[PDB]
Amino acid sequence: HMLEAKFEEASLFKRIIDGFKDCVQLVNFQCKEDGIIAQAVDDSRVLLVSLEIGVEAFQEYRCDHPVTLGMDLTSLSKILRCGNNTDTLTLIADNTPDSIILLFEDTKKDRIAEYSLKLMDIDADFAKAEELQYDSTLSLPSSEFSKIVRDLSQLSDSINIMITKETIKFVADGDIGSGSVIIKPFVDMEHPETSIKLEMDQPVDLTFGAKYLLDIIKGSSLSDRVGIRLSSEAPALFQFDLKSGFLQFFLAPKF
Amino acid sequence: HMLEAKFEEASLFKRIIDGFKDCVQLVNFQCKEDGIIAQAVDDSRVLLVSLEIGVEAFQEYRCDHPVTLGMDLTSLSKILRCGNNTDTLTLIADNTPDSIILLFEDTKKDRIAEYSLKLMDIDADFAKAEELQYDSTLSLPSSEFSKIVRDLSQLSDSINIMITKETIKFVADGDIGSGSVIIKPFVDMEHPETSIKLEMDQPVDLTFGAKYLLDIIKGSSLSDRVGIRLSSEAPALFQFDLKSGFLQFFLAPKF
Amino acid sequence: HMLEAKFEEASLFKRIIDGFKDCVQLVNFQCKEDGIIAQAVDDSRVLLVSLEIGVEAFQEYRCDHPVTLGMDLTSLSKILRCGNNTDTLTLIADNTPDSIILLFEDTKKDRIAEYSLKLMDIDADFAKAEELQYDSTLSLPSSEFSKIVRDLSQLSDSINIMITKETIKFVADGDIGSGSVIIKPFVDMEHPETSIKLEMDQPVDLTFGAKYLLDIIKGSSLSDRVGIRLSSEAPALFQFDLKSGFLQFFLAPKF
Ligand SMILES: [Mg+2]
Ligand SMILES: [Mg+2]
Ligand SMILES: [Mg+2]
């Protein structure tokens, strides 16, 4: 076929879609020689979600020329929980397709499950949105980021992020009280993956909608770490990196 | 109580009502397990305004069974400017209520302000009016839409909208002269939120009353973007999307 | 100059960078009185790469005080294939440099090639990550390790390593079938360098991403042997030893 994109772990594609599905209905997947880009805005038209999966993330990848797969994510995710986790998953399609074929292959025995999913026609033009320089760049465990966001969103729909020298501060003020989380750059010798990194070019003081942050943290499924890039000028970028790809969320400050 | 619908930002409900109040006197709010729908027609009986706020727009939401709140918007908006902006706001009511309780809670200190607003009895049957397919769908910054409408309404009470391939054209002819605004689909790399999207299934050539467009643009308060859906057959739909909801305006072409 | 670090074989520094360049974009080289440490994480933020080159690896070494050289590896490797292999290579820099000078000297005739490479500003804090004790330590030919990894990665993105008494077992289960490699500690009398050594303090059963293992094996360029240290508690350590240095990869198990 024209496109044959083989994930060795179907669970990888399931975790990708879990990064999207709770805040996006429709997603266009543009498949190219160098891999797959998907983009979608959330129902409120405030959050841009951008996925890039390069050729090397796949066991085998072939796509001579572009193919656009407009998919309903509620449909795709009834079917994406059809792997075994252990299954491989190949996305298969032809030119200007009307359906996408999801081919699950068992990695224990002799079983194939071929699904054909009806595609939808979607606009669709894409934003490659990341700036050349940001005011501050940081990274931390995505489980730590998720907890901070879940915790403070209990208090307020607005979470203020402040970056100062060697200081990252999240703050929310609610009717039952207030929360302030201060994290400092820290390299963990025993478990480096839990480190916190900060590069500050200038201080940042920006407020974000917690309801959007609660969508963003579902990228946790893809990466144990999250990179955050902040700018007084441009939307904030929240990035969950895969092996040969990433899931990006762009979000303007509230003010 | 039977209904307890907690906005974490009272300003959110104020901005919702600001979308309505200048063209609608009376509004029935139907509260359900999945959130709130309000509907009203303007005094001239030409513009239908439809609001839907889902459960997730609220910090906390409970409504076992339907509750209908007929409110005078001039009254509701003397009281809706009683929050601090920083206040939370819970709408509270019981079965077949005669009043609605607006409970504002301070997010800095220990203060509660409980208002009880007398309700009015209103008909009231609701139209879920959006079609399955439209001729053309587009979205743009609501501030850009507002400016175009404010600018051209200075010239004429009729604004013609024409959709052709990759072209959106607004036109007005007045006694002091004429205006033509042409916008083209454009994805902005640095500030995606300012992008213009167009999906044309067939060309459109429709004229609308500028006085109604000037009511519609007050939805600007709720969303930085506006979706517009146009049809030779059905009313035009102008849509301002919230986090877990929307404000919709339906408007027939003038001819 | 402040730093003058002379490799007698430019090919040595080329082989070092080949250990990094396919999984890391940017690398900070910290130069000190006792030699050079470089550290970088891969694009997915899962693999930590740590290089240490001591003074004795160099024909001549001088560096009174720290110097940090942030280098783009794609740039450094267009230039690092500028030696003849037979050339010596001196890295030269001054205090808080903006460029690094690579001075290649011919070991046959009278020729010097001086390159000046623009440096990049990088965070950069470093993890000295190795634990005091691991559950199991082993070493084997790096070409044997590479083959096992290349072979099993054809089958699966997950390679399970199990250590039991006098037994090292690598296993992968794929859609076309499964592979199990069992190696046993063995001292080779004729070619000791090909021996396999195992020290087991407790049994190990850990699964690793094959895509990361495929990055790690490129350390083959530096050493004919690889040491592996495994722990139920800490990341796995894969180590390629030079004369007076090493290249280390730290990698958490998949589960
Ligand atoms: Mg598997
Ligand atoms: Mg607040
Ligand atoms: Mg030589």
Numbering used by the authors:
A (entry chain A), B (entry chain A), C (entry chain A): 0 to 254
What's in the article?
PCNA is a ring-shaped homotrimeric protein, with each subunit consisting of two domains connected by a flexible linker called the inter-domain connecting loop (IDCL). CAF-1 association with replicating DNA, and the targeting of newly synthesized histones to sites of DNA replication and repair requires its interaction with proliferating cell nuclear antigen (PCNA), the eukaryotic sliding clamp that acts as a processivity factor for polymerases during DNA synthesis. Recruitment of PCNA-interacting proteins to replication forks is generally mediated by a conserved sequence in these proteins called a PCNA-interacting protein (PIP) motif that interacts with PCNA in a region between the two domains on a single subunit near the IDCL. In this study, we focused on three separation-of-function amino acid substitutions in PCNA that cause defective gene silencing and exhibit reduced CAF-1 association with chromatin in vivo, as well as inhibit binding to CAF-1 in vitro partially or completely (D41A/D42A, R61A/D63A, and L126A/I128A).
The X-ray crystal structure of the L126A/I128A mutant PCNA protein was determined to a resolution of 1.93 Å. The L126A/I128A residues are located within the IDCL of PCNA, which is directly above the canonical PIP-interacting region. Compared to the wild-type structure, there are significant backbone changes in the structure of the L126A/I128A mutant PCNA in the IDCL. The α carbons of residues 123 to 129 have moved from 1.8 to 2.9 Å relative to their positions in the wild-type PCNA structure. Similarly, there are significant backbone changes in the structure of the mutant PCNA protein in loop B, which is more than 15 Å from the substitutions. Finally, there are significant backbone changes in the structure of the mutant PCNA protein in loop D, which is approximately 15 Å from the substitutions. The α carbons of residues 41 to 44 have moved from 1.5 to 2.7 Å relative to their positions in the wild-type PCNA structure. In the structure of the L126A/I128A mutant protein, we observe clear electron density in the vicinity of the IDCL, loop B, and loop D into which we modeled a portion of a PEG molecule and a chloride ion from the crystallization conditions. To our knowledge, binding of small molecule ligands at this site has not previously been observed with PCNA. Of the three mutant proteins crystallized, the L126A/I128A substitutions cause the most dramatic changes to this surface cavity compared to the wild-type protein.
